[PDB]
Design a protein around this ligand. Structure first.
Ligand code: 1SN
Ligand code: 1SN
Ligand code: 1SN
Ligand code: 1SN
Ligand code: CA
Ligand code: CA
Ligand code: CA
Ligand code: CA
Lengths: 389, 389, 389, 389
């Protein structure tokens, strides 16, 4: 049975801890994949952490990170939410140096991108077998969300980028059913830049908060309808939620245009709350350290800088990184609405630390009806490791 | 289908060995969590050992126990009864430095407490997702049973303490259905102290035997009804079952009041037998070594010191620790009554031994209709470990 | 649904390799229990290897075999046929230094014996929980088969010995349903000795071939009916199948009496074939090395020494050990009859080899309708191991 | 329910990456079998990688490859497609130094060959138990496909060779149902040689592309009907697809006869496409390095050398090896036709590299309706390993 997922995103006053995998502490002696870009998506039965592996294990010579990013060994694999990315509980998903995955209520669909940069291929798995393919349409690093894709009433949606990472590129919305592409759309967005979207369903449409790696310190936003007609632009709020970014005082919002005039970015997320928004970000304006989440009144729809709530989850003494959005299927939460959840990736090692390797653990949070006290569920690993000698 | 659990606790003349995990012997070379406070609860299909992890493994540098107690890395996880707490068979449960868990017949409900001491949060998982929340109501280490909670006819009950650990604090009884709090109650108990309850169902009500960490060497007892009206007091028997405690000869029982005038405590348990009680305790009056279980005639209801039976399970040359209560669901035992079982935690390392680490293995016992000979199913590990060099 | 198991044992001309676990080769680097006395029994879905563990792993200091035989850490655990006895695929069964296990068609029943020698207890698990108990009735090492027990039409049978191991002792047949003892019987056998029976169903009765550790180099045999009325005696064949034993030429058979006048023994097995028998034995008359299986015409019923077939499975340059019987449930083989199978334990280390440890791997064979060539599927491990330095 | 598998093989313009196990990179620190000849076959639910183990692990002294090829320790085991051949996720299949396996829609059937070279036995497992047997009929290394066997409408087919490996031998086609041989056929092929077939269903018949290890650099081909009447010969195409082989320019095809006049070979595969063929091969004419797949128009039926497509999957700087064919069951792909897939084995170590050991990882590809860019999903392991010191 197909998951409806037409309900509205729940309105929430705070986020409770869902899980924490401690992969890297565990990785010190146990057998754990050196991973990167983990993310969470849910079936109507269990939620899973998906990730990308080098094929190498923590504390092993193959974790030498001279092994490139988009390498032929890179794969998408998965475990259950909370478990470390260990070999012995890992499920194979796809060959991928970039991925999205989501469940429609019947089976898991995953999309893994691999191949050469100039001519990459994106393979669609449905129920654990390839069912379809997308080739690079612009010849420049075909790539996708690295967070959950979105399924409504049996059709699954996601967003991909083919083009340069630091200037204008091209963007597309795909629609598959049972792992067959059944629709696509080009996205007009001259001046604007879209990378690594974080998406979720909301009122029978797909809402995304993405990454502008060209010029904007605000996050681009798009809203997709089942007919693949779309609206696109930026998160209106007069507060920047990208890294690097400038200061809140020296920032003017926009619903239409990049602002901030800064190059680089990071994957991040946001949830519509009526006309409010929960926007997450790192605490540092420049580095991937700390993580917090602000609620701005009328933020989804105006250049508001009115903060109604602020909750810290990783303190600014500790390393953060990527973060993304997903919902709890109604079939799991029991609510009549879609419970908004997010995960925060905590990167340890290169570039900031003196190890030959890089990986990340994770923490997962879900919307609750109460305020949650600030804390820091940070990574915990004690660097460097034996391998680093 | 909801588990009835309205039947009476079975009357039993002794306890048979259920399981023994040997986690720490196994941990010498294999990949085993450094754990603390394991406990057992049963679904209508299988019984599980739940525990709290540091995220670290035995014989690994991260088992350095300078890592605090209520740490952000602490999690509740679980395996099947008898299996060691190994990474590769472990199931993630919750973020927690204090936990309760129980099954209602349809799904597992778990409750994990985490956050800062002054403002802690307790997340309720149902079927593996957070479904609800309790915030600290007294701002002083919100915390709970560390043993099985109790489910009757679809609603699950448990007991939490917010307050100081060495004087008067506050105590509450919670009632959830499908992971939603649907009732709560404050517990009047001036002079009395309640920590870390061990509970089980009995005649359609919840009976607990808990820990007084303030002044009493007897165990506080409470009996909860589905309407959250309760009775509270102490185990009547004129014999003290806490550690530290005094001697049996120099002790006068009470059904209402702490006695013994000693500060510290330990988690322990007891089963009503009509008006008799099976009370467990450590063999040493002062240290967590050895473990035995006495049956006192009319002990639940009078200041009796009449010992009908005594059974040793861990000898006084070996380390014990915490212990708690659970029942076999009728659906597993086949009996028309609720078979009483308990687990005994065996702590190795700090404080009593020269290691940088602390963990525990476990042994599980269940009520039988016969007398069982005394023996010592003690831990077995040969300390210290490689890491300790 | 209960397994019928009333059909006759199949008549077979040879045995095909079922499985080989290679536990000890694997154990060299992987995480494998140091085990002893593995055996096989089948559900109507899969067959499993059960074993006894020290709780220790190969190549670990806890495999130091100064750790006694009937120790408090000893447990019965299980994996699927063919898999090594590894921690991460192991299922907990029972606390035991002696065990039997069998499946009735609905659930697994296991029986584990533990406790002190003078007053041992045997716990019956049904569907993974204790359901009943047998205490030592003669106060002298209560103990059992170490091979599959036998289930016919919903009731399961097995055989236990309480007494001395080198003279006259006592013997009993137990009958349980859904893990409740529902019948028992004492076995008159003055002069005769019964240890460690190997049993299987055959024409709606239970047939066993056991170990005489008192005086007989032939194997005692018993045949049990559902009403627990029995017949008992020895395997008639004029050929000795125990170790140590004498030579075939200097041996006179008996259907009633021990013969051979030699003390020690070993667990072994035999299958009735109409009036013929497949008897297994080690190749050496004195040591547990090599393993072969002879078919003697009219061997079950006369002092025949007529060998119709001989098949070698472990060559006499390699270590053998215990061996036992089990059948394939009709629901798995598809035959209209009960396919006879056996397993051979291959012991490595103490006493014959210079290691601080002892364990065993295994090979499993099943009756086929053809002759199978002789070969040697021996253990394979290269001794000693790192730990032995 | 039986899998139909009567549909035609899909016509495909290219192959997408299915999986990549990275076993050997992973094997550097984790617990991974030293394997050889992995292959893939699919149930109507999941696809699996089957392999042969020494019983030894990577980086362990038992991976010393002086341990012979057809050894008594050799076993067939299996994991899910994409997962490494790790101990802890491995399922036992059979005792085998040569194997085939396939699923009929109800259960897995496997065939493992073991025993002595002069008198080998092939055991048939159905649903995880032996159900039947084939003894060596020519007394010279009875052996089989090392790739998926083929099931149509409930009966499973495969091909075996008994004889010498470098001259004329004997060849047979077997037909089992539910693990019982129900038909067999001798194959007249004087002058021609058949080893290690790669097979798949196609239009309700079984098509194989095999290995001529006697004289032919082209691949022998056979087509089997459910009545075990067959046609046999060679892949017509005027292009050689074996290793070693000569050059394309100096080669004349044949539909009937070996050509190339070279001794040795390698396992490889081919798919009929109407009258076209997708033939795979190594890139080197002499060594097992690189892997590519050519589509030759009218190749199945004429001496065509017309290349319509060429796709590289392992570049000629990297080690390849064996390769074989399998299909996706309709129940998984959703197509109305049989999706052709293949796997390529990548051998590391002896003979070409300075290690004491030999194993292989793998990559899996499936027919898609598009052209896929060339890339190299090569092994990745960094040789030699710790053990090699
Ligand atoms: C290529 C466009 C950008 C996305 C804004 O590159 C990402 C920049 C980035 C970051 O830290 O912001 C990380 C992404 N990435 C992917 C990978 C490998 O595919 C898996 C570790 N490595 N780094 C990069 N993605 C890819 C497909 O290489
Ligand atoms: C805080 C009140 C008391 C309970 C009587 O503290 C326990 C005292 C205790 C004991 O040995 O009696 C142990 C409990 N504990 C929990 C923890 C961590 O949360 C998991 C290892 N460490 N110690 C302690 N509980 C918490 C929430 O820290
Ligand atoms: C006690 C009677 C005999 C059985 C003929 O002892 C067995 C003698 C024996 C042998 O090698 O023939 C082995 C059995 N055994 C059991 C055990 C432990 O319980 C598990 C390793 N060790 N050895 C022994 N059984 C027990 C309950 O200790
Ligand atoms: C015996 C006929 C040939 C097949 C063309 O031998 C294969 C030659 C070969 C190759 O590299 O082409 C490898 C096959 N093989 C099997 C094995 C062991 O059975 C498992 C590693 N080793 N090598 C060999 N097969 C067997 C049954 O030994
Ligand atoms: Ca940016
Ligand atoms: Ca106290
Ligand atoms: Ca004897
Ligand atoms: Ca050739």
């Amino acid at each position: 049975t197909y998951m409806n997922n037409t309900e509205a995103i729940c309105d929430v006053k705070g986020f409770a801890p869902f899980s924490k995998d401690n992969g890297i502490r565990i990785g010190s002696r146990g057998h754990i994949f050196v991973i990167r870009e983990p993310f969470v998506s849910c079936s109507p039965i269990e939620c899973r952490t998906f990730f990308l592996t080098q094929g190498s294990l923590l504390n092993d010579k193959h974790s030498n990170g001279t092994v490139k990013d988009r390498s032929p060994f890179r794969t998408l694999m998965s475990v259950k939410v909370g478990q470390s990315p260990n070999v012995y509980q890992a499920r194979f998903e796809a060959v991928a140096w970039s991925a999205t995955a989501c469940h429609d209520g019947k089976k898991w669909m995953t999309v893994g991108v691999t191949g050469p940069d100039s001519k990459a291929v994106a393979v669609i798995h449905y129920g654990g077998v390839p069912t379809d393919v997308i080739n690079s349409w612009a010849g420049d690093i075909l790539r996708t969300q690295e967070s959950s894709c979105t399924c409504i009433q049996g059709d699954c949606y996601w967003v991909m980028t083919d083009g340069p990472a630091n200037r204008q590129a091209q963007y597309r919305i795909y629609k598959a059913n049972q792992g067959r592409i059944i629709g696509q759309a080009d996205i007009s967005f001259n001046g604007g830049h879209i990378e690594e979207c974080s998406c979720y369903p909301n009122d029978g449409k797909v809402e995304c908060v993405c990454r502008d790696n060209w010029t904007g310190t605000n996050r681009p936003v798009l809203v997709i309808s089942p007919d693949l007609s779309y609206r696109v632009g930026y998160l209106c709020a007069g507060i920047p939620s990208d890294t690097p970014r400038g200061e809140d005082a020296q920032f003017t919002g926009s619903c239409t245009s990049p602002m901030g005039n800064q190059g680089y970015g990071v994957k991040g997320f946001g949830f519509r709350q009526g006309t409010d928004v929960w926007m997450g970000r790192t605490i540092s304006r420049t580095s991937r350290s700390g993580f917090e989440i602000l609620r701005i009144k009328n933020g989804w729809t105006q250049t508001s800088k009115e903060q109604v709530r602020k909750q810290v989850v990783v303190d600014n003494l500790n390393w953060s990184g990527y973060s993304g959005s997903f919902t709890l299927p109604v079939e799991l939460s029991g609510k009549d609405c879609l419970v908004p959840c997010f995960w925060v990736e905590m990167i340890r090692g290169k570039p900031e630390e003196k190890t030959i390797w890089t990986s990340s653990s994770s923490i997962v949070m879900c919307g609750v009806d109460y305020e949650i006290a600030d804390w820091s569920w940070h990574d915990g690993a004690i660097l460097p490791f034996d391998i680093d000698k």
